[PDB]
Design a protein around this nucleic acid. Structure first.
Ligand SMILES: [Mg+2]
Ligand SMILES: [Mg+2]
Ligand SMILES: [Mg+2]
Ligand SMILES: [Mg+2]
Ligand SMILES: [Mg+2]
Ligand SMILES: [Mg+2]
Ligand SMILES: [Mg+2]
Ligand SMILES: [Mg+2]
Ligand SMILES: [Mg+2]
Ligand SMILES: [Mg+2]
Ligand SMILES: [Mg+2]
Ligand SMILES: [Mg+2]
Ligand SMILES: [Mg+2]
Ligand SMILES: [Mg+2]
Ligand SMILES: [Mg+2]
Ligand SMILES: [Mg+2]
Ligand SMILES: [Mg+2]
Ligand SMILES: [Mg+2]
Ligand SMILES: [Mg+2]
Ligand SMILES: [Mg+2]
Ligand SMILES: [Mg+2]
Lengths: 260, 134, 169, 182
RNA sequence: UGAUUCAUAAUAACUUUUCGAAUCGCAUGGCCUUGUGCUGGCGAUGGUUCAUUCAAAUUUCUGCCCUAUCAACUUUCGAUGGUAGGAUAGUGGCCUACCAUGGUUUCAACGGGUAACGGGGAAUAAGGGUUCGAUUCCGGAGAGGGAGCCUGAGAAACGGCU
RNA sequence: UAUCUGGUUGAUCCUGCCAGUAGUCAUAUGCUUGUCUCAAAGAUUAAGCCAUGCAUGUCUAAGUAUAAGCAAUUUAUACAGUGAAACUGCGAAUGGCUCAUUAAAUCAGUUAUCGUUUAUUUGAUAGUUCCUUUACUACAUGGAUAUCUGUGGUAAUUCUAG
């Protein structure tokens, strides 16, 4: 209506915040950034509801101002900066380096990553075009645009970005039997190998993907992110490791593991 | 008799805010209510913090005396506590002073009045004075 | 009378409702880019005028009390370096930190000095900033060039590889 | 604008009012387990009713297959915890027929009386109301509490207040004062 | 790329030649051709098309409550299509010119009614249902009515204007 | 959590309805009303009319500050501490409200923009402005306008003429 909408109501807020239904009218609208509103995570939600390093919004703001937070090398001061999938949040006091990675259920898991790994960022490939002055450039689904990529870096590949410099360390070619991580819908957060690629002219390229448990599932190509070669992922994944157990199994795990 | 059995559950050390934040859990056996100052003192004794940089809020006792479950922080310094903690908390503690101000409605009215006038008010005053004869 | 101002170039000796945007006289627009229809009095002199504004340009005989006897000096003074220079009659070589009407005011017992906040100069800091900017412009460009060169080299290598792959059947 | 706080008009009236036999039965039940109203009975029925419905639903799918297996099992476990279900009966089709009487019997109403303490149901209820009885060491004053069986052995008189024996309690104090005066 | 007159790069010109940092806070380094010389840090804002994000208009398919005591309607005054222009941020009868006679319809067009804003949902509750949805979320409309426009990235805004 | 009863009859079994019965984040109202948590609440009639007040403005180490302000003292012989006012910026197109229109319209999911604009966003990035090439604007180009201070009009208005 009449131009860009500026608020986000707390029910309309995306579920993988894991916000309270109650406790205020609104939720933080993640501002214009390198990630899509619903597939993002603002710095309020991270430092208040997940980590609980700030008891409230004001506290979070204060922390931001203090400038111990750094989402992907640069500093940030905006409460509602959309830090999305693969973004590396480093709090310099604590030295609690994090990478924003999904849990098997779907929500963003707080992955307490080491200092040596929290340095690069793995990122997908959205486009490969040439800009002005005839220079080829790659675009990432995770924000950045990098000039001059190795000619054999094509669409839907993944790219290890040095992050500090904002360059290209290395890449993985998207292909059959190469470790992949899922970022869309019912399979969001799982991890698998890649078996097929149903081509389909226009209407969404599907991908048959099996996990470590030999459990198959299918997703669209845009909802899949190439994380390594089977056995060696390029990033440390959280406990569970994109398996996603059955409900019964989960229950069993819960009520077997009673260690007071 | 009672001994004010204090605990400090869920201790999160906060280098960002420069504090140790935690759930205060506390017991009364036969006493009823703990009191805030007392709690603060206890915390100080425990943590070597001093009341000045201890800061507590929340609580609401369980039901049938016995227990109380509030929220307490212990800043890395007094200065730090002062420059982070909200003002209300400070006031409650005694550290800071109560900020003497006008009513909200009154303030709003004043603002409106200001908006209605233009430039400096001195000129307006002068004009009024001049009119006084007319 | 009644109180609508005599706007210039309107003509008639009459009261006329007129649409007025920002840029003209006769409307202080309270929204940045707002037209509004205010009444305005024509530019011609008739009977209903309580007042005609008159610039007493060239002098005569009788100086009246304090209209042409006393002189109210200028409240403000040249703010830019260039402006100051113009005011004075100096040129660039005279150098800078003075030609300014510093004040001496008292609270009561204490009596101390005011000065301006004068603008535009060959400021050392400014110069430094400029230099830095220039360096950035240079250096960045150089880096870009280097990158381009590298890319070209890579491309060449790739081409060579392709050629090698080809020469077989 | 926060969100609608949800509720349920949980506890539901019967479809006829004056089925005489039914009424009599209800009255009898009340007498047995000292209730203030038929309301409580209705609530109990609703609670049980829901469970029954769930069981039926589960049955309507194949036991062996997943939801039925799991959800049903969970329900059974819950029932066992509550202490309405026995340990002999954990087969879902046993839940199907639990009965309201059983449910009533599990209340902190009766689990005071059943364990002695009070003497005469109503008395127990009164005691519960008047800030005695702590299931843990936290004073329950709801009659319709439903005791956890796992925490039925832990039902004591309150740490504070009389009967537990911390303070004698008001009338006693008055009497003492009178004696002193004398 | 499924697919282009695509990306994009050259040749040719025009252009009432856009842009191309006479910008603000800290800090005050490096070579002496010993001038005050030439040089160089941390940042702010602007500014170009390409990204992205927030969005934006449209747009594909399928789905609405009652009525035949509405069977024809649309097409002089755009109806349907074409060609060309004009306009628009752009598609397009959006508008103009010229031509063709189409287009929809008992698989209810068109008209009339709604004490109809749409949906999520609500009440009831064996199964199938029936009724309600002004109203906490998502959309859409409106700011007494109807019109018109300024500013602006975005309004046909009404705590803007005419 | 599949349930029916009274009523034509002289009595009987049906058609059949009436009547009861149960529910309603479904309204109203009549009595009554001690407590705990929770809480809708001028939609239904009049998208009827509105006194008064308030509901959008806003400056940082970092846009401009000789308030003839504050405050003052151990950077100003162009400036440097705070800062009313005003011009520049950005914001006021969000939010809130309401449901009048509106029935293939809106809306729901579903596509598409190879059919477009997109301040903001984060990523990016411009040696070619010269115009014959033996004496030419750079270590900083110009004049305005507001605050103010002054000369005012008006019965008045968030009025503004010199
Ligand atoms: Mg496509
Ligand atoms: Mg300057
Ligand atoms: Mg007591
Ligand atoms: Mg082209
Ligand atoms: Mg056309
Ligand atoms: Mg409806
Ligand atoms: Mg209506
Ligand atoms: Mg609705
Ligand atoms: Mg209505
Ligand atoms: Mg709405
Ligand atoms: Mg009205
Ligand atoms: Mg309007
Ligand atoms: Mg209004
Ligand atoms: Mg508005
Ligand atoms: Mg039925
Ligand atoms: Mg008959
Ligand atoms: Mg009879
Ligand atoms: Mg009836
Ligand atoms: Mg009304
Ligand atoms: Mg303003
Ligand atoms: Mg709105």
């Amino acid at each position: 209506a009449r131009g860009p909408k500026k608020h986000l109501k707390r029910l309309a807020a995306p579920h993988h915040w894991m916000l309270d239904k109650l406790s205020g009218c609104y939720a933080p609208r993640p501002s214009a950034g390198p990630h899509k509103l619903r597939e993002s995570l603002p710095l309020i939600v991270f430092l208040r509801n997940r980590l609980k390093y700030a008891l409230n919004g004001r506290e979070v703001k204060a922390i931001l101002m203090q400038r111990h937070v750094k989402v992907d090398g640069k500093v940030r001061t905006d409460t509602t900066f959309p830090a999305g999938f693969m973004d590396v949040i480093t709090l310099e006091a604590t030295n609690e380096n994090f990478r924003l990675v999904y849990d098997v259920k779907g929500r963003f898991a707080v992955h307490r990553i080491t200092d040596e790994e929290a340095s690069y960022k793995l990122a997908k490939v959205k486009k490969v075009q040439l800009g002005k002055k005839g220079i080829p450039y790659v675009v990432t689904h995770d924000g950045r645009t990098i000039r001059y990529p190795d000619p054999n870096i094509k669409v839907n590949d993944t790219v290890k970005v040095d992050l500090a410099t904002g360059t290209i360390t290395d890449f993985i070619k998207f292909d059959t039997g190469k470790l992949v991580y899922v970022t869309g819908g019912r399979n969001l957060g799982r991890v698998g190998t890649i078996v097929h690629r149903e081509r389909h002219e226009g209407g969404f390229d599907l991908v048959h993907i099996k996990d470590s448990l030999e459990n198959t599932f299918v997703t669209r190509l845009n909802n899949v992110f190439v994380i390594g070669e089977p056995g060696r992922p390029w990033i440390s994944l959280p406990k569970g490791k994109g398996i996603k157990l059955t409900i019964s199994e989960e229950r069993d795990r819960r009520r077997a593991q009673h260690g007071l | 008799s009672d001994a004010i059995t204090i605990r400090t559950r869920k201790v999160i050390s906060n280098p960002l805010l420069a504090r140790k934040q935690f759930v205060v859990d506390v017991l009364h056996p036969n006493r009823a209510n703990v009191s805030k100052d007392e709690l603060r003192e206890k915390l100080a004794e425990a943590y070597k913090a001093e009341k000045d940089a201890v800061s507590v809020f929340g609580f609401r006792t369980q039901y049938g005396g016995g227990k109380s479950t509030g929220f307490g922080l212990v800043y890395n310094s007094v200065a730090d506590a002062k420059k982070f903690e909200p003002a209300y908390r400070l006031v409650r503690y005694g550290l800071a002073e109560k900020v003497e101000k006008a009513s909200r409605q009154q303030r709003k009215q004043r603002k409106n009045r200001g908006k209605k006038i233009f430039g400096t008010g001195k000129s307006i005053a002068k004009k009024a004075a001049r009119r006084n004869a007319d | 009378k009644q109180g609508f101002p005599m706007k210039q170039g309107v003509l008639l000796p009459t009261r006329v409702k007129l649409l007025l945007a920002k840029g003209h006289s006769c409307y202080r627009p309270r929204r940045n880019g707002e037209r509004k229809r205010k009444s305005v009095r024509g530019a011609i002199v008739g009977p209903d005028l309580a007042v005609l504004a008159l610039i007493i340009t060239k002098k005569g005989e009788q100086e009246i009390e304090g209209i042409t006897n006393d002189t109210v000096p200028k409240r403000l003074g040249p703010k830019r370096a260039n402006n100051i220079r113009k005011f004075f009659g100096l040129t660039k070589e005279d150098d800078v930190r003075d030609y300014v009407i510093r004040r001496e005011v008292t609270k009561g017992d204490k009596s101390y000095t005011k000065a301006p906040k004068i603008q535009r100069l060959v400021t050392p800091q400014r110069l430094q900033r400029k230099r830095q900017q220039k360096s950035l412009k240079i250096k960045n460009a150089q880096a870009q060039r280097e990158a381009a060169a590298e890319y070209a080299q890579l491309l060449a290598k790739r081409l060579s590889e392709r050629k090698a792959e080809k020469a077989e059947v | 604008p926060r969100a609608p706080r949800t509720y349920s008009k949980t506890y539901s009236t019967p479809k006829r009012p004056y089925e005489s036999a039914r009424l009599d039965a209800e009255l009898k039940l009340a007498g047995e387990y000292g209730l203030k109203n038929k309301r409580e009975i209705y609530r109990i029925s609703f609670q049980l009713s829901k469970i029954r419905r769930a069981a039926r639903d589960l049955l309507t799918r194949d036991e062996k297959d997943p939801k039925r297996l799991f959800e049903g099992n969970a329900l059974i476990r819950r029932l066992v915890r509550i202490g309405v279900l026995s340990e002999d009966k954990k087969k879902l089709d046993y839940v199907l027929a639990l009965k309201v009487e059983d449910f009533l019997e599990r209340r902190l109403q009766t689990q005071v009386y059943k364990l002695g303490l009070a003497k005469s149901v109503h008395h127990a209820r009164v005691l519960i109301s008047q800030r005695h009885i702590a299931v843990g060491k936290q004073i329950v004053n709801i009659p319709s509490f439903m005791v956890r069986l796992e925490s039925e052995k832990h039902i004591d008189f309150a740490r504070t207040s009389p009967f537990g024996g911390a303070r004698p309690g008001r009338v006693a104090r008055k009497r003492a004062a009178a004696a002193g005066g004398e």
